[PDB]
Amino acid sequence: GSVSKWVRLNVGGTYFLTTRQTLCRDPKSFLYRLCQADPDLDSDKDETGAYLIDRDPTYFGPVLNYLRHGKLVINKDLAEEGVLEEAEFYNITSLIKLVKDKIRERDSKTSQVPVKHVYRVLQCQEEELTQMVSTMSDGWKFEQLVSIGSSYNYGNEDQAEFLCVVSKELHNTPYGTASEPSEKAKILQERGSR
Amino acid sequence: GSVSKWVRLNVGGTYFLTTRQTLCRDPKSFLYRLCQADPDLDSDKDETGAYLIDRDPTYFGPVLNYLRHGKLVINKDLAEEGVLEEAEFYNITSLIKLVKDKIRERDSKTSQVPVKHVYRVLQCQEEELTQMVSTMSDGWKFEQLVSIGSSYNYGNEDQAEFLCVVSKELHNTPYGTASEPSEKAKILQERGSR
Amino acid sequence: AEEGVLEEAEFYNITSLIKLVKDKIRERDSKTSQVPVKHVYRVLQCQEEELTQMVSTMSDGWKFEQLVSIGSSYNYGNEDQAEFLCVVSKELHNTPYGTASEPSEKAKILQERGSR
Amino acid sequence: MASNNTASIAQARKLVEQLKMEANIDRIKVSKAAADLMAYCEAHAKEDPLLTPVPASENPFRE
Amino acid sequence: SELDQLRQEAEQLKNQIRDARKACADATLSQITNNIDPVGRIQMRTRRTLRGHLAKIYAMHWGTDSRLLVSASQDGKLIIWDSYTTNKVHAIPLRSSWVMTCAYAPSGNYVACGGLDNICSIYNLKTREGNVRVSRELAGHTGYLSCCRFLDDNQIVTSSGDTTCALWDIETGQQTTTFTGHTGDVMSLSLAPDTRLFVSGACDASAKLWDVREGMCRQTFTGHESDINAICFFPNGNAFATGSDDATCRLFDLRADQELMTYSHDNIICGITSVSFSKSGRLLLAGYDDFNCNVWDALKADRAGVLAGHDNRVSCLGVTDDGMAVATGSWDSFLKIWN
Amino acid sequence: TLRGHLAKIYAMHWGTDSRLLVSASQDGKLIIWDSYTTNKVHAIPLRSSWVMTCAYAPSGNYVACGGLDNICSIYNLKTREGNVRVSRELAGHTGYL
């Protein structure tokens, strides 16, 4: 017989014993190509027959975990990139997709660490000032106030007396901000642009 | 394997030497049914007799310590989601009910985007300007100061010459931000607003 | 996990080390806490000429926050000490410091005098 | 689906139904409806602040 | 294709409707009775200059109290004005700019807004905290939010793009009764004073009257060739004016199921942008993309009055809930109160 | 003319000395006015606005105020650092104070 309930492998000098049935989760796996017995592939340590593969022992772990229970997981210190490259070596596209998504999220968090900051200008006269500053809407941060020579009175007590610039953040560091299309939306945007 | 007080668990291919009683702390554990000596289970190494568990040895440790002393402490490098899914796998409803509490704290602590920022507009003349600026209430941060021309005392030296915008941060997003209802308070609010 | 080794010690019942570990736990929690550090703000008032100097010679540990011109009437306002109000601030680590109050009788009546 | 022109059976059905209820809708004659609306407007024309010039002692803009 | 039979059924039912309307079509007694109750030459005076806004005032809106009018700029700020004192009760910055609709609750408590963000936000004006905080966000209108209106302090209608006027349960944030009968996106929505029938216009020029209770399209009106911009429901709930991209405006009637009468002139060529009804509804006040805005005798189609020009196109009209005055939200960033 | 406030003044309680009167604004700021010099002895930015009542201790060492937050705030005017600080927050109520 050729079936092995528990086959032994040497990944980077480290021994891994697992069922070939688990090793056959994806027929694209290099390990599946190991499952079949062929003359072109019979290299092993003759002491116990465990096949010799010169690949990393560490990042092979998450691959084995997913292959055993269909869930990928990499520690907060393990190199997502390293496991990506290793799984590419074993040609497991399923993990390549999800590891790629995780790496994309981490890259977005790192690169988009500047959260999109929305800003606004509120025009108020002195009398109306204190209230809107105090009642300033939750989730927003005051940024700057400036005074102008009012059109009426001695540069004061007019609807154009003060401008208060405020701002806030949009939590777009780990997620992707985007836009969407619409036709009448474009028409109206053009109408308002001029 | 064989019956023994010591139990050798080959979790993810890594041996954990613990007590059957620790595993038998509660019956909700799937490990409880593993501890049964019936021949129903055979997923054990034939070279050492250790029971082969294909789950994560890393997130197995938190569960083992919880079963040892009834509390789960997650290593800062291991995500609480991993221990969550682990305890789900072994079906410890109490433990799930606690790790979810851990998440309920962590996610409330982070991403507290609308951390209350109360802004006020103190009006002062330069004479007392330094007085209150020096004596700003502890916890309040000065943010802006603006002069405004006035017709009194050549503008300056008037109590309304300067407006000092001050702010204070306040944590209620991580402490359950909300409001309270009161019918007479509502009546007074509408009375004053107009 | 600091609390992890704490519980490990509790199991092993090393009373002195448990004391030390919970003392360190309390210290870490206090220093982290909600960062109760308090910022103290001062109003330095200097002319433009000396403005560059006292900004440059600004005392390490202190932070510049804002500079405000004054509609002063002395020499168009410029070249005058009261022309500008440079308000600065510096933080005080409240948990290390505490920022508490104490009684002082003559100092109490002095506080009363200086209040008015 | 596409063969049914995006299930055009349903779109035709709802169109037919809406036209059906439109048919069931009473048709108050244009002269009659105009008379009714004119009567209501007149019943309210004498009280409309815009139509009825308010003196500059009650409006909230020259109060 | 059996669909031929179904489309023929639709066509012949439509012809039946046309025939019924023609039977309904008698002499328009109102314009025939032009001699009776002529609104005369009304000269309407502006009295307040709510110049606090800076961006274009896309949509204004009054309040049930008939004193506080909420207006939205293009830049994303809502100004709840105090009409009678020129004061600004509030000034709300909006998470996303490009807003064209401002909705005031039927209480004076909540305000809703929406725009190209494809989300309608509802802000609680009155809260224990003493400030204005966003209460609810409504997403699902994949298209832009064109116009919204508050049925209740928990029920709101949001005429949007994506060809829908979904009725939103504020608390759950869930749209309850969809209105999918339209083909072109919706840029208008007018509530009956009964608050049971609302008329929505779209780029298909199909002013569909809907029943709030079921989502069914109660009626369809098509007297306008171009896209419909603004609908002002008649004070009785039995008829409504409807303006379209054309320079013309046409008053339709629910009972007549057909355009009661039309409002157009040679000198006016700019597309309509806002339609309004006086306290009685006898005055049809219309805002144009022309800087000037006018008012017609609603039952005589003649120019009842002309409003003093602005520096830019008018963009929204709102009469006082009592009809005391009317505010003209124009693109020159000035709301003008007219009485 | 103690024209220092800019919001509505909801309460004004004198001090036993009959020289310092503490007043509260609608927007949440307390001004310990100096009646004889029209000079702001103190400006106190309240944590939460909508305060209707301002209380002055008999000793002039404390000021209390109450708002829609339903928590009475007790401010210790006299502290070593010289900056007014919140002394006590009185919770337990539910209605506006």
UniProtKB/Swiss-Prot annotation, chain C:
Biased amino acid composition, Basic and acidic residues: 103-116
Species for this entry:
Homo sapiens
> What domain of life does the native source organism fall in?
Eukaryota
Q: Where is this region: Disordered?
A: 96-116
Q: Which gene does this sequence derive from?
A: KCTD5
What is the name of this protein? BTB/POZ domain-containing protein KCTD5
Function recorded in the entry: Its interaction with CUL3 suggests that it may act as a substrate adapter in some E3 ligase complex. Does not affect the function of Kv channel Kv2.1/KCNB1, Kv1.2/KCNA2, Kv4.2/KCND2 and Kv3.4/KCNC4.
- What induces its synthesis? Up-regulated in peripheral blood lymphocytes stimulated through the T-cell receptor.
Cellular compartments annotated: Cytoplasm, Cytosol; Cytoplasm; Nucleus
Record text about domains: The BTB (POZ) domain is atypical and mediates the formation of a homopentamer instead of a homotetramer.
Known partners and oligomeric status? Homopentamer. Interacts (via C-terminus) with GRASP55/GORASP2. Interacts with CUL3 and with ubiquitinated proteins. Interacts with CRY1. (Microbial infection) Interacts with adeno-associated virus 2 (AAV-2) REP proteins.
UniProtKB/Swiss-Prot annotation, chain D:
Where is this protein found? Answer: Cell membrane
Give the gene name: GNG2
Q: How does it assemble?
A: G proteins are composed of 3 units, alpha, beta and gamma. In this context, interacts with GNB2. The heterodimer formed by GNB1 and GNG2 interacts with ARHGEF5. The heterodimer formed by GNB1 and GNG2 interacts with GRK2. Forms complexes with TAS2R14 and G-proteins; these complexes play a role in the perception of bitterness. Component of the TAS2R14-GNAI1 complex, consisting of TAS2R14, GNAI1, GNB1 and GNG2. Component of the TAS2R14-GNAT3 complex, consisting of TAS2R14, GNAT3, GNB1 and GNG2. Component of the TAS2R14-GNAS2 complex, consisting of TAS2R14, GNAS2, GNB1 and GNG2.
Organism of origin is Homo sapiens
Q: What family is it from?
A: Belongs to the G protein gamma family.
- One GO BP: G protein-coupled receptor signaling pathway
Has the keyword Cell membrane been applied to this entry? yes
Q: What is this protein called?
A: Guanine nucleotide-binding protein G(I)/G(S)/G(O) subunit gamma-2
What tissue expression does the UniProt record report for this protein?
Expressed in fetal tissues, including testis, adrenal gland, brain, white blood cells and brain.
**Its function?**
Guanine nucleotide-binding proteins (G proteins) are involved as a modulator or transducer in various transmembrane signaling systems. The beta and gamma chains are required for the GTPase activity, for replacement of GDP by GTP, and for G protein-effector interaction.
Tell me the Pfam families matching this sequence.
G-gamma (PF00631)
Q: What membrane topology does this protein have?
A: Lipid-anchor
GO CC entries: extracellular exosome; heterotrimeric G-protein complex; membrane; plasma membrane; synapse
Q: According to the UniProt entry, which residues carry N-acetylalanine?
A: 2
Please indicate which superkingdom the organism of origin belongs to: Eukaryota
Swiss-Prot record, chain E:
The protein's PTM annotation reads: Phosphorylation at His-265 by NDKB contributes to G protein activation by increasing the high energetic phosphate transfer onto GDP.
WD repeat segments run: 45-93, 94-139, 140-180, 181-222, 223-266, 267-308, 309-339
Q: Name one GO biological process term.
A: retina development in camera-type eye
Q: Which residues carry this modification: Phosphohistidine?
A: 265
Outcome of mutating residue 51 to G: In MRD42; decreases receptor-driven G protein activation; no effect on protein abundance; no effect on complex formation with gamma subunit; decreases trimer formation with alpha and gamma subunit
Q: What is the effect of changing residue 90 to R?
A: In MRD42; uncertain significance; no effect on protein abundance; no effect on complex formation with gamma subunit; no effect on trimer formation with apha and gamma subunits; no effect on receptor-driven G protein activation
Q: Which InterPro entries match?
A: G-protein_beta_WD-40_rep, Gprotein_B, Guanine_nucleotide-bd_bsu, WD40/YVTN_repeat-like_dom_sf, WD40_repeat_CS, WD40_repeat_dom_sf, WD40_rpt
Q: Which UniProt keywords apply?
A: Acetylation, Disease variant, Host-virus interaction, Intellectual disability, Phosphoprotein, Repeat, Transducer, WD repeat
- The reply to whether Phosphoprotein figures as a keyword in the UniProt entry is yes
Quote the annotated effect of residue 29 to F.
Answer: In MRD42; uncertain significance; no effect on protein abundance; no effect on complex formation with gamma subunit; no effect on trimer formation with alpha and gamma subunits; no effect on receptor-driven G protein activation
Q: Superkingdom, according to UniProt? A: Eukaryota
Reported effect of changing residue 95 to L?
A: In MRD42; decreases receptor-driven G protein activation; decreases trimer formation with alpha and gamma subunit; no effect on protein abundance; no effect on complex formation with gamma subunit
Q: What GO annotations for molecular function exist for this entry?
A: GTPase activity; GTPase binding; protein-containing complex binding; signaling receptor complex adaptor activity
Residue positions of the PTM Phosphoserine? 1
Where does the record place the modification N-acetylserine? 1
Please give an example of a GO cellular component term from this record: membrane
**The protein's name in its UniProt record:** Guanine nucleotide-binding protein G(I)/G(S)/G(T) subunit beta-1
Gene (name only): GNB1
